[PDB]
Short mmCIF file of all heavy atoms in Angstrom, two decimals:
data_model
loop_
_atom_site.label_atom_id
_atom_site.label_comp_id
_atom_site.label_asym_id
_atom_site.label_seq_id
_atom_site.Cartn_x
_atom_site.Cartn_y
_atom_site.Cartn_z
N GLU A 1 0.88 -1.20 -0.01
CA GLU A 1 0.00 -0.01 -0.02
C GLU A 1 0.90 1.26 0.01
O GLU A 1 2.00 1.20 -0.34
CB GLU A 1 -0.88 0.08 1.25
CG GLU A 1 -1.31 -1.32 1.84
CD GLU A 1 -2.11 -2.12 0.86
OE1 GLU A 1 -1.40 -2.69 -0.03
OE2 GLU A 1 -3.32 -2.14 0.90
N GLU A 2 0.21 2.40 0.34
CA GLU A 2 0.82 3.65 0.72
C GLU A 2 1.98 3.42 1.69
O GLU A 2 2.99 4.10 1.63
CB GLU A 2 -0.20 4.53 1.36
CG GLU A 2 -1.66 4.04 1.11
CD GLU A 2 -2.07 4.19 -0.30
OE1 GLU A 2 -2.39 5.25 -0.72
OE2 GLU A 2 -2.04 3.24 -0.98
N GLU A 3 1.77 2.44 2.54
CA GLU A 3 2.64 2.12 3.65
C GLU A 3 2.74 3.28 4.62
O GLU A 3 3.69 3.36 5.42
CB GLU A 3 4.03 1.56 3.18
CG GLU A 3 4.91 1.18 4.37
CD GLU A 3 6.27 0.73 3.91
OE1 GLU A 3 6.44 -0.25 3.17
OE2 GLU A 3 7.27 1.49 4.20
N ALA A 4 1.85 4.24 4.48
CA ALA A 4 1.65 5.23 5.43
C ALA A 4 0.56 4.49 6.31
O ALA A 4 0.43 4.70 7.49
CB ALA A 4 1.08 6.47 4.92
N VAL A 5 -0.19 3.82 5.54
CA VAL A 5 -1.29 3.06 5.95
C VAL A 5 -0.95 1.63 6.49
O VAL A 5 -1.46 1.17 7.26
CB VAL A 5 -2.21 2.96 4.86
CG1 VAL A 5 -1.49 2.27 3.77
CG2 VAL A 5 -3.33 2.10 5.32
N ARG A 6 0.19 1.04 5.94
CA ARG A 6 0.57 -0.21 6.43
C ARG A 6 0.86 -0.21 7.86
O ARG A 6 0.66 -1.07 8.64
CB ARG A 6 1.74 -0.68 5.60
CG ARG A 6 1.42 -1.20 4.22
CD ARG A 6 2.54 -1.83 3.56
NE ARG A 6 3.08 -3.01 4.28
CZ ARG A 6 4.32 -3.44 4.35
NH1 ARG A 6 5.28 -2.74 3.74
NH2 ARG A 6 4.54 -4.60 4.91
N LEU A 7 1.47 0.94 8.25
CA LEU A 7 1.70 1.33 9.55
C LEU A 7 0.45 1.47 10.29
O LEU A 7 0.30 1.13 11.43
CB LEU A 7 2.13 2.75 9.50
CG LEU A 7 3.39 2.90 8.64
CD1 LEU A 7 3.45 4.35 8.16
CD2 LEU A 7 4.62 2.50 9.48
N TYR A 8 -0.38 2.19 9.61
CA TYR A 8 -1.65 2.57 9.92
C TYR A 8 -2.52 1.37 10.32
O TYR A 8 -2.96 1.29 11.40
CB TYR A 8 -2.20 3.33 8.75
CG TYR A 8 -3.05 4.34 9.13
CD1 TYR A 8 -2.63 5.67 8.92
CD2 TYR A 8 -4.17 4.14 9.79
CE1 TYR A 8 -3.41 6.68 9.21
CE2 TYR A 8 -5.00 5.15 10.22
CZ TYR A 8 -4.65 6.46 9.89
OH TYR A 8 -5.37 7.46 10.33
N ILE A 9 -2.62 0.52 9.36
CA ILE A 9 -3.24 -0.74 9.57
C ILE A 9 -2.56 -1.44 10.66
O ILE A 9 -3.25 -2.07 11.49
CB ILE A 9 -3.01 -1.54 8.23
CG1 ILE A 9 -3.58 -0.87 7.07
CG2 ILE A 9 -3.45 -2.86 8.43
CD1 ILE A 9 -2.79 -1.08 5.91
N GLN A 10 -1.25 -1.27 10.74
CA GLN A 10 -0.44 -1.85 11.83
C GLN A 10 -0.80 -1.28 13.16
O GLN A 10 -0.79 -2.00 14.17
CB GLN A 10 1.02 -1.67 11.50
CG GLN A 10 1.98 -2.34 12.42
CD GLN A 10 1.77 -3.81 12.56
OE1 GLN A 10 2.44 -4.59 11.81
NE2 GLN A 10 0.99 -4.26 13.48
N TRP A 11 -1.15 -0.10 13.11
CA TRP A 11 -1.57 0.73 14.09
C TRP A 11 -2.98 0.16 14.57
O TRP A 11 -3.34 0.04 15.80
CB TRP A 11 -1.64 2.05 13.65
CG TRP A 11 -2.20 3.18 14.48
CD1 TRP A 11 -1.78 3.67 15.67
CD2 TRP A 11 -3.40 3.79 14.20
NE1 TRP A 11 -2.64 4.66 16.08
CE2 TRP A 11 -3.65 4.74 15.22
CE3 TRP A 11 -4.31 3.66 13.18
CZ2 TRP A 11 -4.79 5.51 15.21
CZ3 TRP A 11 -5.29 4.46 13.17
CH2 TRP A 11 -5.69 5.35 14.18
N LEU A 12 -3.81 -0.03 13.54
CA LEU A 12 -5.13 -0.62 13.68
C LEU A 12 -5.13 -2.14 14.16
O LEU A 12 -6.11 -2.53 14.59
CB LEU A 12 -5.75 -0.37 12.40
CG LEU A 12 -5.99 1.09 12.20
CD1 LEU A 12 -5.80 1.54 10.90
CD2 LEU A 12 -7.32 1.54 12.77
N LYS A 13 -4.00 -2.88 13.87
CA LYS A 13 -3.96 -4.17 14.31
C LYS A 13 -3.90 -4.14 15.87
O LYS A 13 -4.13 -5.12 16.58
CB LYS A 13 -2.72 -4.89 13.79
CG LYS A 13 -2.86 -5.49 12.40
CD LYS A 13 -2.08 -4.76 11.42
CE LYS A 13 -2.22 -5.27 10.01
NZ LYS A 13 -1.61 -6.63 9.89
N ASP A 14 -3.48 -3.03 16.32
CA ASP A 14 -3.39 -2.87 17.83
C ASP A 14 -4.70 -2.21 18.17
O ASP A 14 -5.09 -2.33 19.41
CB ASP A 14 -2.23 -1.87 18.23
CG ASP A 14 -2.00 -1.78 19.66
OD1 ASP A 14 -1.36 -2.73 20.16
OD2 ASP A 14 -2.39 -0.78 20.35
N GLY A 15 -5.34 -1.53 17.27
CA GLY A 15 -6.66 -0.96 17.53
C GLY A 15 -6.86 0.32 16.92
O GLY A 15 -8.02 0.95 16.92
N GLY A 16 -5.82 0.83 16.27
CA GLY A 16 -5.84 2.09 15.63
C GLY A 16 -6.35 3.27 16.52
O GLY A 16 -5.69 3.47 17.47
N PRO A 17 -7.36 3.94 16.20
CA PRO A 17 -7.97 4.98 16.98
C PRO A 17 -8.34 4.55 18.41
O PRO A 17 -8.92 5.31 19.18
CB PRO A 17 -9.16 5.51 16.21
CG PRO A 17 -9.35 4.59 15.11
CD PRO A 17 -8.17 3.74 14.97
N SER A 18 -8.10 3.30 18.79
CA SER A 18 -8.26 2.77 20.07
C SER A 18 -6.92 2.17 20.60
O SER A 18 -6.94 1.49 21.68
CB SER A 18 -9.39 1.77 20.11
OG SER A 18 -10.55 2.31 19.67
N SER A 19 -5.83 2.39 19.98
CA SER A 19 -4.53 1.77 20.27
C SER A 19 -3.90 2.64 21.53
O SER A 19 -3.08 2.00 22.24
CB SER A 19 -3.55 1.81 19.13
OG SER A 19 -3.44 3.23 18.72
N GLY A 20 -4.32 3.82 21.69
CA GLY A 20 -3.69 4.69 22.58
C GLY A 20 -2.61 5.51 21.84
O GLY A 20 -1.82 6.31 22.49
N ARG A 21 -2.46 5.26 20.58
CA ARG A 21 -1.51 5.82 19.75
C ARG A 21 -2.26 6.86 18.86
O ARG A 21 -3.26 6.53 18.33
CB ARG A 21 -0.88 4.85 18.79
CG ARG A 21 0.22 4.00 19.42
CD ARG A 21 -0.18 3.20 20.53
NE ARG A 21 0.87 2.63 21.38
CZ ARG A 21 0.66 1.75 22.31
NH1 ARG A 21 -0.51 1.39 22.74
NH2 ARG A 21 1.81 1.24 22.97
N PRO A 22 -1.66 7.95 18.62
CA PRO A 22 -2.01 8.78 17.64
C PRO A 22 -1.60 8.24 16.25
O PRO A 22 -0.48 7.65 16.09
CB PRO A 22 -1.21 10.11 17.87
CG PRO A 22 -0.76 9.91 19.21
CD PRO A 22 -0.52 8.52 19.41
N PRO A 23 -2.53 8.27 15.29
CA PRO A 23 -2.45 7.58 13.99
C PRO A 23 -1.17 8.00 13.21
O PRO A 23 -0.75 9.11 13.23
CB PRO A 23 -3.74 7.97 13.26
CG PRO A 23 -4.52 8.72 14.12
CD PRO A 23 -3.71 9.13 15.35
N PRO A 24 -0.74 7.10 12.31
CA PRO A 24 0.56 7.29 11.55
C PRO A 24 0.36 8.38 10.48
O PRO A 24 1.33 8.95 10.06
CB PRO A 24 0.82 5.91 10.87
CG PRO A 24 -0.50 5.18 10.97
CD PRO A 24 -1.32 5.74 12.08
N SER A 25 -0.87 8.56 10.18
CA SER A 25 -1.28 9.61 9.26
C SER A 25 -0.67 9.30 7.88
O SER A 25 0.35 9.85 7.48
CB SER A 25 -0.82 10.98 9.73
OG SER A 25 -1.23 11.18 11.11
#
């Protein structure tokens, strides 16, 4: 992908907007 999003998705594998992390954007 964009791999801004692969991170993102990766962020979302943790829960994304519920990870406790601000998104990779």
Side-chain angles (χ1 to χ4, degrees):
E1 330 301 80
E2 342 293 278
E3 185 187 293
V5 57
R6 281 189 67 209
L7 304 153
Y8 216 114
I9 303 151
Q10 182 58 89
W11 173 71
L12 294 144
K13 280 114 180 285
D14 190 78
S18 304
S19 58
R21 282 58 191 186
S25 305

